[PDB]
Write a protein that binds this ligand. Structure first.
Ligand SMILES: [Zn+2]
Lengths: 98, 24, 81, 132, 139, 83, 208, 129, 215
RNA sequence: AAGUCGGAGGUUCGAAGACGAUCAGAUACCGUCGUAGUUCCGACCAUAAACGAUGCCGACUAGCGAUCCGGCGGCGUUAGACCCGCCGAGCAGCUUCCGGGAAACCAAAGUCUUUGGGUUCCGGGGGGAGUAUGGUUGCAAAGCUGAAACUUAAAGGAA
RNA sequence: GCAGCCGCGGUAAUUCCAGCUCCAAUAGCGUAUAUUAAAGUUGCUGCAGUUAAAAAGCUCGUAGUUGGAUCUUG
């Protein structure tokens, strides 16, 4: 049975796409089939932002961030629980969670 | 598996051919 | 719309349709007399000219070829019948 | 763990929809009413039914309950809902009309009316919301 | 789809001609095979000499001993294994006696829980096996 | 249906849709038979007269029931022709 | 009504313009396009009030054609039209359903709220989609106050009007009740109706 | 490519009748179409159609009466005789009481009943009922 | 009989004279007593198939019986109802009630000459249910029902004396077989023939005519 | 893609292989290396779940919001960009009782017992078997064409 | 041992060996094989090829097949 209309990838009217490597296991995954996640986090987390700010040499220095674009294969994205299996009707929801 | 069965078949064709060329 | 009148369509919808899909196909193009400000002779040029037309005497350039209707120069008239 | 069973709540609603005029805000008064108008094989069940009747009676006095439907109560609350202002909210001194709406009335017999006030049509078609 | 043309008779006739061979029933009865491999050679019955009495195990889930006889055909020398149909009729079949065997009921197919026996005994010693089973004939 | 001699042999003559001429089946429960009352040409009051329209469930389900009744009212003079 | 006595008067236009019944939103239906006049610069479509009145009278003619007034069922699930259908029922003698429409009142005969009306007037085709789809299993025509984006899956008489604003939905039930009584002969159509249109309007809890 | 024009003409009519349309626009017109629509019109299956001249193949706007169940073509145009005409009446027509099979005979385009009354066979164009 | 619907009250009070009045207005029949009031005299029922369907539960198999009942007066009226209940007697009883509420008018025509009462189907109709399709074809007066035993019981109870039948699909499925045949019979009186081209003269609905009696 | 032959180059990776772990055993998964290969040039090979598991051409049968290209005319903003529509072309999406289907689902997988627009290839229970043999192609690996005896009452799809 | 098929038989077998009884055709009735209908499971009528067996990886291309409208109507 065809489980998904897009076959699990965002490829339409296109023959081949260049692959990438999953961050957990370096395996060849198509760029559209990859479960991407652009994570923007601070270099200093909230548990340590107090000590770093009070020990700074500047009056007002904002801590930088880590702009990392993570890529995941289907298998590792589910073991890492970044995507869950949804109901047969809930799968059709293409909106990101709030 | 259908692919390893296909591999066992080609390994068998290659043996039947060499056994047939010996008596050629 | 089960009883839409196909024999008598409104002129606002026939101009909307493609020039081939109309009830009777008709071009969306036309001709026009271009009067340059330098000379007095008027030249009948095509709307979708696609060539570089010139006035009699090589006074100036009238329009320029484009992907659609030709782009006229400054100070010219058009829309003849 | 003070949730009433459907046996307590259903029997309490039927008692109200049939004997609303006999019940009140006193448990011990309703306890004796339910004992007579209803044959309850237990006394604990009667106190639970009468105790929930007293609870529902405190709700009827403030408004309609989504379970209790009394004819004499619904007709009066609808009759007492007849409220109208001293002047209607539609007959206004001036009426703002878009120039496109003004042209629609122009095609009808109501071309020029003193009650109409044409507003300046705002420039810029920014009605759609940005995508993404 | 199919060709619906006024001059497509040869195209349709040749297509059906070559697609009928994909039908295993048509191909079986239109080639040299399955007729020479058939021990009867196209006949409904055949006579043979009983080589030995053999008991064939009934296939699962059934469990019994099918009383059969290894028969050598007289017409072509082929050795087949018939089946003594009725109850206890194996005792009527002597040794090295001429018997008339026929198909088991299906065209070259094994009938019932018997693994491969596709024949059955009809007569024995020029006497029908049904007459010996009912006692109306002897020997 | 006739019997080639004048006799009528049908159990009943089924209705036909006033918009698509489709026969309204006996189990077409989505079909309707709406009656639109007529008014007096002076007072505009009900004069016990009405126009009858039957629309099968197919024309309703496809959404063309409202436009069909509006057009059927034009041919009967119920709605105006400046519509 | 194509007569002169049934024409829209000037007093009716001032009510429609004040209530905003000509403003029907930015979305448009392909079967409600014939009722739309023109789209403004801010995307809002203008409903043709002339075609709103003709469909309003056509609905009133279908209501007065029902002999028993209790055979007409007025339904409004949304709170904006709950008071408007309760006043319409008292004026016309209809059976109102203003609360939550229980699925089964038309098909399930063993239910307590089981009814068998002959006409089904609806406030919103989307908010009241359940009685519309249930009026398909029984041969019941339906009238609805369809907006510009309202579907016509079963609506037999669509009244194009702004069924979103409280002053607009209350007026469309006041205009229809006024016309049903005028065709029956209760009111003479010569003098203005005694009932004020604000009686049918919805009142917010912060104001009532 | 459009190898048959009568096919697309009757297909548009059959689909417009299924949709409850009042009029259908046949984009390519021909002599066979106009005479085919005439056979359907003489028996009351379609209304009056208006041929539209555009100095090309031409278009036709047919008025649909709703009385037509299905109209279709028979491709290819087989050669039909009088002895073989009853065979097509059992395969194409829905009953022996109504429905017609249009034939193009040397005497012109007509249905199977008129072709039998004129006692002439020919080629089959289509059917309607 | 205590009528619950307005349609049942008019039938109980002798306001509706025949069953063709309900079919004329496509009104739903929700009370089986309405059917027994008109056709209850010459109405015959037949148990086509007792079909045990099983729901996989931990208690081995939960066997529930589904019955197929064909109801018809053998002239112009036939019905088909299914009912799946725990008991066989209850499944048959409930299916008979549903077979009455589904009774449709059967239109019968002639083959060639129109002499006497109608004997066969008016035209070629095809009913479908699942993969099964059943085509009904007219036949001469003395032909009979040339069909399988399953549609023959429906065609004889529908008053169709003669019919040529062709069936494609899994006709071993008696459920889809009987329902496709019943669908083919129900397609009659809805096929627009030239003899039904006349403009319909609209009458008053039973709810409209007897609106005063229903008050 | 892998593979094959001849040159150039071989950073990374890595069949094979070695060794270190894990295990009852691993000749595996995991780790440290590492040959061929991966790269380039020329000549072969012509096979993929080469998939949209859905031939190509043409007509017709709903709606809506987007999007890519071109064209067209309209407030306004900006120095072509944006905004609002229309037309043709295309990749898609969604809502629908258009209809179809065994159903999943499909605006096509519709217009189909109311069966015929044109045309090519191709399927006939499951195995045996893409095997045997013959021919042909290739340096080879293998490609293409392609059976039968015999065996079997199910195999399978969707839910 | 029965059983074309699904199955029956492991100590109360409605299926085998028999008695009784009943049923079917009837001076005929079984069996084996070929063959026709059943088979719309060979397809012109008239099937199929998204997932059940299936549309060549893709395109070009000869033969083959099939090809717009239009010419004497009234
Ligand atoms: Zn991974």
């Amino acid at each position: 049975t065809k489980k998904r209309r897009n076959n699990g990838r965002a490829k339409k009217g296109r023959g081949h796409v260049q692959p990438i490597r999953c961050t957990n296991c370096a395996r060849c995954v198509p760029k559209d089939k990859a479960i991407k996640k652009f994570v923007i986090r601070n270099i200093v987390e909230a548990a340590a932002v107090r000590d770093i700010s009070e020990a700074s040499v500047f009056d007002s220095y904002a801590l930088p961030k880590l702009y990392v674009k993570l890529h995941y294969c289907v298998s590792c994205a589910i073991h890492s629980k970044v995507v869950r299996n949804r109901s047969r009707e809930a799968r059709k929801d293409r909106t990101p969670p709030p | 598996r259908a692919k390893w069965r296909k591999k066992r078949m080609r390994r068998l064709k290659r043996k039947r051919r060499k056994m047939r060329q010996r008596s050629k | 719309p089960l009883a839409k009148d196909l024999l008598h369509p409104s002129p606002e919808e026939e101009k909307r349709k493609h020039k081939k899909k109309r009830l009777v196909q008709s071009p969306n193009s036309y001709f026009m007399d271009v009067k340059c400000p330098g000379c007095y002779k008027i030249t009948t040029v095509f709307s979708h000219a696609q060539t570089v037309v010139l006035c009699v005497g090589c006074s100036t350039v009238l329009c320029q070829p484009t992907g659609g209707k030709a782009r006229l120069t400054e100070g010219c008239s058009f829309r003849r019948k | 763990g003070r949730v009433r069973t459907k046996t307590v709540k259903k029997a309490a609603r039927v008692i109200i929809e049939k004997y609303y005029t006999r019940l009140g805000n006193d448990f011990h008064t309703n306890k004796r009413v339910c004992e007579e108008i209803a044959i309850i094989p237990s006394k604990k069940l009667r106190n639970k039914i009468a105790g929930y009747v007293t609870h529902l009676m405190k709700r009827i006095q403030r408004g309609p309950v989504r379970g209790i439907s009394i004819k004499l109560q619904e007709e009066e609350r609808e009759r007492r809902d007849n409220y109208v202002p001293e002047v209607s909210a539609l007959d206004q001194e001036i009426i703002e009309v878009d120039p496109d709406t003004k042209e629609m009335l122009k095609l009808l017999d109501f071309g020029g009316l003193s009650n109409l006030q044409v507003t300046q049509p705002t420039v810029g078609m920014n009605f759609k919301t940005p995508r993404g | 789809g199919k060709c619906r043309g006024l001059r497509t008779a040869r195209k349709l006739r040749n297509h059906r001609r070559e697609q009928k061979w994909h039908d295993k029933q048509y191909k079986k009865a239109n080639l040299g095979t399955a007729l020479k491999a058939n021990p009867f050679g196209g006949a409904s019955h055949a006579k043979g000499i009983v080589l030995e009495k053999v008991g064939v195990e009934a296939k699962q889930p059934n469990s019994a001993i099918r009383k059969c006889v290894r028969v050598q055909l007289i017409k072509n020398g082929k050795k087949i294994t018939a089946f003594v149909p009725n109850d206890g009729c194996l005792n009527f079949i002597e040794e090295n006696d001429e018997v008339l065997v026929a198909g088991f009921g299906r065209a070259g197919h094994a009938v019932g829980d018997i693994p491969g026996v596709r024949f059955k005994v009809v007569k024995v010693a020029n006497v029908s096996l049904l007459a010996l089973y009912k006692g109306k004939k002897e020997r | 249906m006739q019997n080639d001699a004048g006799e009528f042999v049908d159990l009943y003559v089924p209705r036909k849709c006033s918009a698509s001429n489709r026969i309204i089946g006996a189990k077409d429960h989505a079909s309707i038979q709406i009656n639109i009352a007529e008014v007096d040409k002076v007072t505009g009051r009900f004069n016990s007269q009405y126009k009858t329209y039957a629309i099968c469930g197919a024309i309703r389900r496809m959404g063309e029931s409202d436009d069909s009744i509006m057009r059927l009212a034009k041919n009967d003079g119920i709605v105006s022709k400046n519509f | 009504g194509g007569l002169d006595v049934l024409q829209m008067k000037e007093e009716d236009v001032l009510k429609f313009l004040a209530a905003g019944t000509h403003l029907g939103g930015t979305n448009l239906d392909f079967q409600m396009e014939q009722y739309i006049y023109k789209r403004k610069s801010d995307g809002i479509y203008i409903i043709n009030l002339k075609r709103t009145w003709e469909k309003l009278l056509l609905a009133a003619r279908a209501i007065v054609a029902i002999e028993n007034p209790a055979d007409v069922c007025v339904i409004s699930s949304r709170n904006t039209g709950q008071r408007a259908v309760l006043k319409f029922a008292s004026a016309s003698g209809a059976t109102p359903i203003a609360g939550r429409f229980t699925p089964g009142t038309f098909t399930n005969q063993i239910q307590a709220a089981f009814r068998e009306p002959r006409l089904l007037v609806v406030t919103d085709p989307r908010a009241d989609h359940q009685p519309l789809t249930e009026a398909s299993y029984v041969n019941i025509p339906t009238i609805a106050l369809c907006n510009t984006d309202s579907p016509l899956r079963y609506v037999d008489i669509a009244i194009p009007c702004n069924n979103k604003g409280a002053h607009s939905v209350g007026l469309m039930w006041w205009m229809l009740a006024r016309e049903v009584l005028r065709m029956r002969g209760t009111i003479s159509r010569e003098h203005p109706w005694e009932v004020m249109p604000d009686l049918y309007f919805y009142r917010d809890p912060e104001e009532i | 490519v459009r190898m048959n024009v009568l096919a697309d003409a009757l297909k548009s009519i059959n689909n417009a009748e299924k949709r409850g349309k009042r009029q259908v626009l046949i984009r390519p017109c021909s002599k066979v179409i106009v005479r085919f629509l005439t056979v359907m019109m003489k028996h009351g299956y379609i209304g009056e159609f208006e041929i539209i001249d555009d100095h090309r193949a031409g278009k036709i706007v047919v008025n649909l009466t709703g009385r037509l169940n299905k109209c279709g073509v028979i491709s290819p145009r087989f050669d039909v005789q009088l002895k073989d005409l009853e065979k097509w009446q059992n395969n194409l027509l829905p009953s022996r009481q109504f429905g017609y099979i249009v034939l193009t005979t040397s005497a012109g385009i007509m249905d199977h009943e008129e072709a039998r009354r004129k006692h002439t066979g020919g080629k089959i164009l289509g059917f309607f009922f | 009989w205590v009528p619950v619907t307005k349609l049942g009250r008019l039938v109980k009070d002798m306001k509706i004279k025949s069953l063709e009045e309900i079919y004329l207005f496509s009104l739903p029949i929700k009370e089986s007593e309405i059917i027994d009031f008109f056709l209850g005299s010459t109405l015959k029922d037949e148990v086509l198939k007792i079909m045990p369907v099983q729901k996989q539960t931990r208690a081995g198999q939960r066997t529930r019986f589904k019955a197929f009942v064909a109801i018809g007066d053998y002239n112009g009226h036939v019905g088909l109802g299914v009912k799946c209940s725990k008991e066989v007697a209850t499944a048959i009883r409930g299916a008979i009630i549903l077979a009455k509420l589904s009774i449709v008018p059967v239109r019968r025509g002639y083959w060639g000459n129109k002499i006497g009462k109608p004997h066969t189907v008016p035209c070629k109709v095809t009913g479908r249910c699942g993969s099964v399709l059943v085509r009904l074809i007219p036949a001469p007066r003395g032909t009979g029902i040339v069909s399988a035993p399953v549609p023959k019981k429906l065609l004889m109870m529908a008053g169709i004396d003669d019919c040529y039948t062709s069936a494609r699909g899994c006709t071993a499925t008696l459920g889809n077989f009987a329902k496709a045949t019943f669908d083919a019979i129900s397609k009659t009186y809805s096929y627009l023939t030239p003899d039904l081209w006349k403009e319909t003269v609209f009458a008053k609905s039973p709810y409209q005519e007897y609106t005063d009696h229903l008050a």
